[PDB]
Amino acid sequence: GPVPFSHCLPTEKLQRCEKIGEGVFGEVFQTIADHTPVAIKIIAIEGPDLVNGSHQKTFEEILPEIIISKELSLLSGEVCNRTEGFIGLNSVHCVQGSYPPLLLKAWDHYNSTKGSANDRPDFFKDDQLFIVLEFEFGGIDLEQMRTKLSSLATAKSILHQLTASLAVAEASLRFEHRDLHWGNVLLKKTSLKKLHYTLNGKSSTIPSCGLQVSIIDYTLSRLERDGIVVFCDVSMDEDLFTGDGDYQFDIYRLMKKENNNRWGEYHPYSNVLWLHYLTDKMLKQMTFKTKCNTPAMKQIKRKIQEFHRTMLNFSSATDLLCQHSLFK
């Protein structure tokens, strides 16, 4: 059965926790495990209390995310369809306990400095269950880097890396991310000049521009293996489709239009929609340290603009990667 919080989060680990992220699902912390940075996602399950606007999922309802996390993690070590463009999953635990005061301290700090949309997680009782997913530390999200990238050459690398990763997952797993907002794109420095992926047995390279991209957060994701589909059924969700103020919220509606509200089906066009949303963010909501005031860099900008205006005529990330001029 479940283990105590302290099994996953002994004092030293707890003392080094800093909150790095959140969602309706719960909370994400960074800490150190065996001298190694890790990210910990903590989800309340099986309880009756409202949490961040919603009822808690059951164990059965969080199993899809766990399975998808495992499958995408495996892609870094596969051969025919291989990418490091997701995030490694180190472990999963079911924990029982009230929320550790030291996590509440980290939570408070985050609320004080960035602000939170979540309820302070201080109302859980000592019998409360949680799922704790420990992930590889993937760096910092794209939104937080919105004024820090070197140039549009960097932006182009990011788009290429994202497209290739999604293509590899499409090919291997018929994967849709379904929620690839710019908080779910991580960037981490690398000294590698070229990154490698393999799609259906063919290996290719991408110039890194000094960054490795990781796609995270599989709460809404879908995939299948051997005819068994794993997904989040949002067909009766009202609020997911009623946001405004960001193109993000249009994507939810556009996905539902694409799939006729049948979330079990495979519609890799959803990956194209998210990549469109991300291309939009780069061109409109980001600022680079080197402006594109040289001919070479201005050509890159034009290519990203041309991508933005044509990519929605492609049927999948695989179609984009294999056929779009941006990646030739």
Ligand X SMILES: Cn1cc(-c2ccn3ncc(-c4ccnc(CN)c4)c3n2)cn1
**Chain residues in the site for ligand X (CB under 6 A):** 20-21, 28, 39, 41, 87, 135, 137-141, 183, 186, 216-217
For Na ion, the closer CB: 38 or 255: 38
User: By CB under 5 A, is residue 121 in contact with Na ion?
Assistant: yes
For ligand X, the closer CB: 41 or 160: 41
* Nearest distance in Å: CB 70, Na ion: 15
Q: List the helix and strand counts (H, then E) for the chain.
A: 9, 13
Phi/psi at 300 (nearest 5 deg)?
-60, -45
Q: Which of Na ion, ligand X, none sits in contact with 274, Cβ below 5 to 8 A by type?
A: none
Residue 189 burial class via C-beta count within 10 angstroms: exposed 0-12, middle 13-18, buried 19 and up? exposed
- To the question of whether residue 22 is assigned a binding role by annotation, the answer is yes
Which segments within 86-159 are labelled E, that is strand? Answer: 89-96, 129-136, 140-141
- To the question of whether residue 123 is assigned a binding role by annotation, the answer is no
User: By CB under 5 A, is residue 100 in contact with Na ion?
Assistant: no
Task: Say whether 179 is catalytic.
Answer: yes
111 vs 117: CA distance, rounded Å:
9
- To the question of whether residue 184 is assigned a binding role by annotation, the answer is yes
Phi/psi at 180 (nearest 5 deg)?
-95, 55
Q: Which of ligand X, Na ion, none sits in contact with 110, Cβ below 5 to 8 A by type?
A: none
Angle (nearest 5°) at CA 157 between 156 and 161: 120
Q: Which of ligand X, Na ion, none sits in contact with 135, Cβ below 5 to 8 A by type?
A: ligand X
For ligand X, the closer CB: 182 or 314: 182
Residue type, 244: D
For ligand X, the closer CB: 25 or 307: 25
Residue type, 29: F
CB 268 within 8 A of CB 170: yes
Q: Considering 127, 179, 239, 280, which one is annotated as catalytic?
A: 179
CB 32 within 8 A of CB 61: no
194 vs 201: CA distance, rounded Å:
18
* Nearest distance in Å: CB 141, ligand X: 4
Interface segment toward Na ion; rule CB under 5 A; list 2-10, 28-36, 213-221, 260-268: 213-221
Rounded to the nearest 5 percent, the helix, strand and coil shares of the chain are 40, 25, 35
- To the question of whether residue 26 is assigned a binding role by annotation, the answer is yes
- To the question of whether residue 23 is assigned a binding role by annotation, the answer is yes
User: By CB under 5 A, is residue 97 in contact with Na ion?
Assistant: no
For Na ion, the closer CB: 72 or 234: 72
- To the question of whether residue 87 is assigned a binding role by annotation, the answer is no
Interface segment toward Na ion; rule CB under 5 A; list 36-44, 153-161, 242-250, 316-324: 36-44
* Nearest distance in Å: CB 69, ligand X: 8
Residue in the shown chain whose Cβ atom is closest to Na ion: 214
Spatial CA neighbour of 205 closest among 215, 197, 214, 213: 197
Q: Site for Na ion (CB under 5 A): which residue of 56, 208, 214, 259? A: 214
- To the question of whether residue 218 is assigned a binding role by annotation, the answer is yes
For ligand X, the closer CB: 39 or 168: 39
The two beta strands, 89-96 and 18-23, are: unpaired
* Nearest distance in Å: CB 290, Na ion: 26
Taking CA atoms, 180 is separated from 118, 156, 183, 217, 289, in Å, by 20, 17, 8, 8, 25
Binding residues for ATP: 20-28, 41, 136-141, 179-184, 217-219
List active site positions: 179
Binding residues: 20-28, 41, 136-141, 179-184, 217-219
